[PDB]
A paper describes a structure:
C-terminal Src kinase (Csk) and Csk-homologous kinase (Chk) are members of the CSK family of protein tyrosine kinases. These proteins suppress the activity of Src family kinases (SFKs) by selectively phosphorylating the conserved C-terminal tail regulatory tyrosine. The Csk SH2 domain is crucial in stabilizing the kinase domain in the active conformation.
Mills et al. studied the unique disulfide bond of Csk SH2 that is absent in other known SH2 domains. Crystal structures of both oxidized SH2 and C122S SH2 were solved and refined. Therefore, the high-resolution structures of oxidized L-SH2 reveal dual conformations of disulfide bond that were not observed in the lower-resolution structure of full-length Csk. The S–S distance of the disulfide bond was 2.0 Å, whereas the O–S distance in the C122S mutant was 3.7 Å. The disulfide bond formation significantly enhances the thermal stability of SH2 domain and assists in the packing of αB into the hydrophobic region of the protein consisting of βC and βD. The crystal structure also revealed that the linker region fold back on the SH2 domain. Additionally, the hydrophobic interactions between L77 in the linker and L149, F83, and Y116 make the linker fold back to the SH2 and thus stabilizing the structure.
Numbering used by the authors: 73 to 173
């Protein structure tokens, strides 16, 4: 049927930044979704609603390792979400509630 990542509730796939802003409304503390840029796959962007607005955290790749702060690194995107769900660790909020997809 698909990959583990494709069936994740927070993963929306190839949607634009403007469409991500429309989904994460009204602003909810912890409401988040992960969008993929149609670059180039898989240029991901962690879209999370904090302090009344949507903050966009762009995923970067250093030697096939995923990060959004150049401090904490992950093997894959699903490890990134799992980590930031539990603790903020520099982010504006914990990834509390995923936007249903």
């Amino acid at each position: 049927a698909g990959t583990k990542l494709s069936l994740m509730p927070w993963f929306h796939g190839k949607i634009t930044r403007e469409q991500a802003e429309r989904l994460l409304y009204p602003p909810e503390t912890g409401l988040f979704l992960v969008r993929e840029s149609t670059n180039y796959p898989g240029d991901y962007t962690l879209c999370v609603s904090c302090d009344g607005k949507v903050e966009h955290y762009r995923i970067m790749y250093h030697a096939s390792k995923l990060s959004i702060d150049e401090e904490v690194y992950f093997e894959n995107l699903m490890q990134l979400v799992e980590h930031y769900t539990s603790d903020a660790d520099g982010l504006c909020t914990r990834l509390i509630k995923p936007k249903v997809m």
